[PDB]
Amino acid sequence: MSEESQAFQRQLTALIGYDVTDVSNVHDDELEFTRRGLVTPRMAEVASRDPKLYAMHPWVTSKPLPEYLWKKIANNCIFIVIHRSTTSQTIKVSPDDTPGAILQSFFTKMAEQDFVLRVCGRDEYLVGETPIKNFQWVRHCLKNGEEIHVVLDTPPDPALDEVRKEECDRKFRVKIRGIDIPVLPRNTDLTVFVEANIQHGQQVLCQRRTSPKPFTEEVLWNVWLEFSIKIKDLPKGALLNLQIYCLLYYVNLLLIDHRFLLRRGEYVLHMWQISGFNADKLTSATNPDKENSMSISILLDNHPIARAEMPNQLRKQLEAIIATDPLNPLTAEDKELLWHFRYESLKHPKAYPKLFSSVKWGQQEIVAKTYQLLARREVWDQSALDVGLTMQLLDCNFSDENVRAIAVQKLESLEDDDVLHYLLQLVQAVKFEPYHDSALARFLLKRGLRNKRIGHFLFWFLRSEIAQSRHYQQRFAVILEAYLRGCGTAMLHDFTQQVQVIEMLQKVTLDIKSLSAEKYDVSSQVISQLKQKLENLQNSQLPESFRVPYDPGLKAGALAIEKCKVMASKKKPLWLEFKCADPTALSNETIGIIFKHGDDLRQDMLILQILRIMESIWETESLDLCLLPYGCISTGDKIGMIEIVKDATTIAKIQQSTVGNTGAFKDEVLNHWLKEKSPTEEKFQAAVERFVYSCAGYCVATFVLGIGDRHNDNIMITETGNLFHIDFGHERVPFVLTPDFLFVMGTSGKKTSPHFQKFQDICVKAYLALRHHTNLLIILFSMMLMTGMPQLTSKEDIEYIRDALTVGKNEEDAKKYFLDQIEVCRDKGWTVQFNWFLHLV
Ligand SMILES: CS(=O)(=O)N1CCN(Cc2cc3nc(-c4cccc(CO)c4)nc(N4CCOCC4)c3s2)CC1
């Protein structure tokens, strides 16, 4: 290698937070073979990307402008405001105009074309052949009552993005030699055995057990477990899953390796413990903690895989199976039906997930017939893209690489607008891949190299997982390293700045927790220590400026130390505020960020992103629900950052006004609060209208996800009427519609009014509109639980969103379901709100 060629790698190791060159925790060479594998997909994407459009990364959509934004143009004329140091003219522009064309109506409208329209305040450009209607920044301004302010400066140089030069019919059998752990102690002595499973996509093909033996710190069986499955009948992606019961430990081993070879030889595998189903259970990884883990010891000593029309009455039996939801379990009779009529099931793309479940993967001849099936893929290829259907095929139920590859194909037709909607969940879906190198891993590599925005979020998603998941940190680390070797030095410099900042502040965050009592109030001495510490960073430590991880447009600047504080409450988070580092910004307002150790922010990332998916769904049906799904990025273990929505107060603090007698509650307070923060009555009626959409928006979304039983403390509202929930980390009421919310709507329990008629309307409008995407939400929710929670019931927890999206029902019945739910919040009123307080003391 070279001298500075190793300084590059230690730069990579610091942005990843993991050493990919390490081999202390591998029993073969898959990860290093996957570093080499991905060089090609990287150099292909890097080489065929437009340098100019990659530097400016225009954020752009092909979808139609919604109905609720075409009304904000009653005139077919939109207002842009081009700038230059001081002076700045206003240019009249029809929505169908184009970046090039609105420089033609500027220079010619005065009485050389190597200038560019950058946005005031941000690293966001309006460029490339697209209508201004079809730029996201523009749509964001039209949606807010804001006006499009734009500065005119020289394009960023592609030079700064330059990437550096790179560099048998025998049955299967396994001897369980024995297990071994340095120290086990609990209290009483029990017995112990080892269970061995040939597993393919959460489907046991075959299972044998050892005799039991007394659980000493070394148990030796020296026993062959002879299976029934033949070596030829083993499918690629099958896992030998070794588990210990007395269920205390587990570990997996791909029986067929990344090079198609059958697995052979001696293996001492270090095992994962079970904390007192999920995606950690499927991992080919081994416990890196060698000094404290249990270890199994085994031996393989066993290469491979080298007309007629239906009676109308069965067809209806088959169609009814195909109509059902992704969780409705398939009977043996259902599966045999799907499979006997493979070719008719193949005419329906929605049948695919259920059809490839009906395959017996533990038979060689039937897999080979399945590959014959996939070969004539004329209807699947021609069909319209279904994201939920595609996602279904990338979940834990499918480990066949070609089943999974036909799904990733469908994804390649997604534009960047849609990739960013599902990026986090596609990254979590890499946990379900049997092999480190996979079509999905390379799809993400490709899409983040092609677009800096996707590239940026791909970084923080991968880095989130690497930092807090031993089960998948090695794999993701190899994926991330591939990305950082191709994103170009402009972005590598950007990431280095961000990683430096957030490691400075998480230092300050955890150092502040300790000094303050476990819980009581805030020391005067602690507010002194926070100021001193941030004045000691501000000077000779902190970057002049850093990109805001959750909003990569905004470049934060120096700290506004006067407005920074420790937060009086839940695990001493840092309320930090920053100056904006761009001097063409049209505002003196600060970038607010909270830094919190304590809560599992991965869970918030996940709920917030589903919230953004529900916003885009409502886009397809001309509905806006005013949701404020703010930025939140997990950066490590029970730690991360959060976006501070400006001018927002907690609904509980609005009721603490005076006294707040450990739980006094009063109906009319919210409405009076909304009129104080309104200078006019005109802006107050604009706030109530905002509260009707926002309250309705979080009401529906929260019922669907089953996170609607919440304290007033975890629900906020802006000075301008926009309600929103916060903090999604882990008698009943389906959602929060307290009597105070209804008094804004002009209704005090068991009555109706014009504003409440609007709310009821908007709710069912939103509830029916989400049900048109039932399969999407069921499958995202199911995946959310598997990759983003503790241990869960792979039937029972998911079954909520079935009953909540009232599956199998007609539209009328559904409207009734949700309207009953409103009348449960109006029957109980303050009962459940009051109930928080009572438990405590
Ligand atoms: C005395 S005090 O210190 O001045 N004071 C007391 C009252 N609080 C209330 C708040 C609590 C809270 N919690 C989270 C949070 C917590 C965990 C996870 C998540 C992520 O989903 C968000 N996020 C918040 N946001 C700030 C506004 O923008 C939205 C985010 C808030 S605001 C302000 C601080």
Please tell me the distance from the alpha carbon of residue 362 to that of residue 726, in angstroms, as a whole number: 47
* 630 assigned to a ligand binding site: yes
Q: Is 635 annotated as a binding residue?
A: yes
Tokens of 469: 């998941």
Q: Which of 609, 645, 722, 727 to mutate to test the pocket of ligand 1 (most atoms within 8 A of CB)?
A: 727
Secondary element (H or E) of residue 79: strand 78-83
- Whether 726 lines ligand 1, by a CB cut-off of 6 Å, is yes
One-character DSSP codes across 524-555: HHHHHHHHHHHHHHHTTTS-S-EEETTEEEEE
623, 675: one domain: no
For the CA atoms of 458, 461, 467, 468, the dihedral, rounded to the nearest 10 degrees, stands at -150
Give yes or no for residue 707 CB within 6 A of ligand 1: no
Nearest-angstrom CA–CA distance, 546 and 533: 19
> In this structure, are 604 and 554 located in the same domain?
yes
Ligand 1 atom with the shortest distance to the CA of 644: 28
Alpha-carbon gap, residue 319 to 334, rounded angstroms: 11
Does one domain contain both 20 and 140? yes
User: Does 174 lie in the same domain as 157?
Assistant: no
Phi/psi for 810 (5° steps) reads -80, 165
Domain assignment present for residue 555? The answer is yes
Cα–Cα separations (whole angstroms), residue 351 to 288, 324, 380, 401, 794: 41, 10, 10, 18, 21
**Do residues 243 and 209 touch, judged by C-beta distance below 8 A?**
no
421 annotated among ligand-binding-site residues: no
**Token couple for 433:** 């891949």
| Residue 470 domain-assigned (yes or no) | yes
The answer to whether 617 and 602 have CB atoms below 8 angstroms apart is no
Is the minimum distance from the CB of 567 to ligand 1 under 6 angstroms? yes
What SS3 state is found at 270?
strand
Closest C-alpha to ligand 1, atom 21: 727
Residue ID of nearest Cα to ligand 1 atom 9 = 650
- Check residue 262 and report its DSSP letter: B
- Ligand 1 pocket, residue 599 CB under 6 Å: yes
Domain that holds residue 61: 1-166
Residue nearest to atom 4 of ligand 1 (CA): 567
Is there a binding annotation on residue 448? no
| Burial grade of 330 (CB within 10 A; 0-12, 13-18, 19 or more) | middle
Q: Is residue 589 part of a domain?
A: yes
Take residue 101 and report the two structure tokens written for it.
């064309």
Distances (CA, A) of 581 to 122, 490, 584, 632: 9, 17, 9, 21
Q: Are 666 and 655 in contact (CB under 8 A)?
A: yes
Q: What is the CATH number of the domain that holds 675?
A: 1.10.1070.11
Q: Are 712 and 637 in contact (CB under 8 A)?
A: no
The closest residue, in CA terms, to atom 31 on ligand 1 is: 726
Burial class (CB in 10 A: 0-12, 13-18, 19+), 724: buried
Q: How far apart are CA 659 and CA 282, in angstroms?
A: 53
Please state, in angstroms and as integers, the Cα–Cα distance from residue 34 to each residue in 171, 236, 431, 486, 545, following that order: 31, 17, 16, 16, 35
Amino acid at 482: A
d(CA 432, CA 440): 10
Question: Which of the 8 DSSP states describes residue 311?
Answer: -
- Core vs surface per residue 522-561: b (16+ CB within 10 A) or e: beeebeebbeebbeebeeeebbebbbbbbbbbbbbbebeb
DSSP 731: -
Tell me which residue has tokens 């340095």. Answer: 182
Name 773's Cβ contacts closer than 8 Å, sequence gap at least 6: 388, 617
**How would you classify the pairing of strands 551-559 and 639-643?**
unpaired
Residues 268 and 389 in one domain: no
Which DSSP symbol is given to 586?
Answer: S
Q: Which residues pair with 592 in a beta bridge?
A: 577
Is 102 in contact with 80 (CB distance < 8 Å)?
yes
In whole angstroms, give the CA distance from residue 825 to residue 839: 21
Question: Of 591, 613, 646, at which residue does a domain stop?
Answer: 646
Same domain, 620 and 543: yes
**Atom of ligand 1 at shortest range from CA of 604:** 21
Residue 456 lies in a domain: yes
| DSSP secondary structure of 173-241 | EEEEEEEE-S----SS--EEEEEEEEESSS-EEEEEEPPPEE--SEEEEEEEEEEEEESTTPPTT-EEE
- Give the type of residue at 470: R
- Determine the Cα–Cα distance for residues 724 and 721; give it in Å rounded to an integer: 10
- Which CA distances in Å does 334 have to 203, 322, 354, 356? 17, 10, 9, 12
Q: Write down how long the chain is.
A: 841
Please give the backbone phi and psi of residue 641, each rounded to the nearest 5 degrees, phi first.
Answer: -120, 165
The angle formed by the CA atoms of residues 430, 434 and 438, to the nearest 5 degrees, is 60
What is the spatial distance between Cα 361 and Cα 229, in angstroms, rounded to a whole number? 11
Number of the ligand 1 atom closest to the C-alpha atom of 608: 21
Atom of ligand 1 nearest to the CA of 648: 27
Q: Is the CB of 644 under 6 A from ligand 1?
A: yes
Clarify whether residues 808 and 826 are in a common domain: yes
Q: 596: annotated binding-site residue? A: yes
Name the packing angle between helices 439-450 and 452-468 (round to 10°).
130
Residue of 400, 37, 362 lying closest to 236 (CA atoms): 400
- Alpha-carbon torsion, ordered 386, 387, 389, 394, to 10 deg: 140
One-character DSSP codes across 698-722: HHHHHHHHT-----GGGEEEETTS-
Q: Is the CB of 724 under 6 A from ligand 1?
A: no
Does 307 lie in the same domain as 281? no
Task: Answer whether 568 contacts ligand 1 (Cβ < 6 A).
Answer: yes
Q: What are phi and psi of 591, to 5 degrees?
A: -80, 110
Instruction: Write the CA distances from 215 to 96, 184, 274, 625, integer angstroms.
Output: 74, 9, 17, 58
Nearest to 290 by CA among 25, 529, 51: 25
In whole angstroms, give the CA distance from residue 710 to residue 725: 9
Domain boundary among 302, 337, 357: 302
SS3 (DSSP) at 816: helix
Q: How far is the CA of 600 from the centre of ligand 1 (A)?
A: 14
Tell me if 650 CB under 6 Å of ligand 1: yes
Gaps in the chain (C to N over 2.5 angstroms) fall after: 111, 167, 246, 276, 302, 306, 730
**Are residues 137 and 58 located together in one domain of the fold?**
yes
Asked if residue 122 is part of any domain, the answer here is: yes
Question: With contact defined as beta carbons under 8 Å apart, do 115 and 154 qualify?
Answer: yes
CA angle (745, 750, 756) in 5-degree steps: 25
Top mutation candidate among 594, 641, 719, 728 for ligand 1, by most atoms within 8 Å of CB: 594
Q: What one-character-per-residue DSSP string does 288-310 give?
A: S-TTTS-EEEEEE----------
Nearest to 60 by CA among 132, 163, 114, 167: 132
Distances (CA, A) of 108 to 89, 104, 152: 14, 6, 16
Annotated ligand binding at 632? The verdict is: yes
Cα angle, residue 345 at apex, residues 341 and 349 outer, rounded to 5°: 170
Token pair, residue 833, equals 């709100």
Binding residue per annotation — 629?
yes
Residue bearing the CA closest to ligand 1, atom 23 = 726
CATH number at residue 249: 2.60.40.150
Residue 289 in marked binding region? no
Sheet holding 125-126, edge to edge: 90-93, 78-83, 148-153, 116-119, 125-126
How many other C-beta atoms are found inside a 10 Å radius of the C-beta of residue 736? 23
Determine if residue 634 is labeled as part of a ligand binding site. Answer: yes
Q: Are 325 and 774 in contact (CB under 8 A)?
A: yes
Ligand 1: residue whose CA is nearest its atom 27: 644
Angle, alpha carbons 691-692-693 (nearest 5°): 95
CA distance 60 to 431: 30
Q: Closest Cα partner for 653 from 594, 736, 716?
A: 716
CATH number of the domain enclosing 18: 3.10.20.90
Residue 416, annotated as binding a ligand: no
Could you tell me if 593 and 641 lie in one domain?
yes
* Distance between Cα 656 and ligand 1 center (Å): 16
* Position 83, amino acid: H
Instruction: Evaluate: CB of 641 within 6 angstroms of ligand 1.
Output: no
Nearest residue to 438 (alpha-carbon basis) of 411, 414, 465: 411
Distance 713 CA to ligand 1 centre (A): 9
Residue 83 labeled ligand binder? no
Phi, psi (rounded to 5 degrees) for 108: -70, -25
Query: Considering the domain boundaries, does residue 214 fall inside one?
Result: yes
CA 346 to CA 338: how far, in whole Å? Answer: 10
Centroid of ligand 1 to alpha carbon of 729 (angstroms): 13
Q: Are 464 and 450 in contact (CB under 8 A)?
A: no
For the chain, the distance separating the N- and C-terminal CA atoms, rounded to the nearest angstrom, is 66
| Residue minimizing CA distance to atom 7 of ligand 1 | 650
Which among 438, 460, 488 is the end of a domain?
488
In-domain check, residue 585:
yes
* 841 domain residue, yes or no: no
Nearest C-alpha to atom 8 of ligand 1 is from which residue?
A: 650
Atom of ligand 1 nearest to the CA of 729: 18
CA distances, 150 to each of 67, 111, 157 (Å): 25, 21, 19
Closest Cα to residue 352, out of 388, 318, 387, 389? 389
Q: How many structural domains does the chain have? A: 5
**Alpha carbon of 606 to ligand 1 centroid (Å):** 18
In angstroms, the CA 65 to CA 401 distance is 38
What CATH number has the domain bearing residue 624?
A: 3.30.1010.10
Q: Are 590 and 563 in contact (CB under 8 A)?
A: yes
Q: How far is the CA of 565 from the centre of ligand 1 (A)?
A: 12
* Residue 730 known to bind ligand: yes
User: Ligand 1: which of 522, 564, 569 to mutate, judged by most atoms within 8 Å of the beta carbon?
Assistant: 569
Nearest alpha carbon, ligand 1 atom 10: 650
Residue 551 Cα to ligand 1 midpoint, Å, equals 18
Using left for φ > 0, alpha for ψ between -120 and 50, and beta otherwise, residue 208 falls in beta
Nearest to 733 by CA among 712, 708, 715, 711: 708
The Cα–Cα gap between 201 and 206 comes to 13
For residue 381, which phi and psi values (nearest 5 degrees)?
A: -65, -40
Concatenated DSSP letters for 616-679? Answer: HHHHTTT---------EEEEETTEEEEE--TTEEEHHHHH-SS---SS---TTHHHHHHHHS-S
Residue 594 among known ligand-binding residues: yes
277 CA to middle of ligand 1, Å? 32
| Cα gap 122→50, rounded to integer Å | 22
> Both 517 and 561 in a single domain?
yes
Torsion over CA: 491, 494, 500, 502 (sign): negative
* Cα–Cα distance list, 524 to 405, 538, 575, 774 (Å): 59, 21, 16, 52
Q: Work out which ligand 1 atom sits closest to the CA atom of 567.
A: 3
Report the 10 Å Cβ neighbour count for 685.
14
Tell me: do 296 and 176 sit in the same domain: yes
H or E element in which residue 80 lies: strand 78-83
CATH of the domain at 326: 1.25.40.70
Compute the distance from residue 792 Cα to the ligand 1 centre, in Å.
Answer: 28
The answer on whether 148 is annotated among ligand-binding residues is no
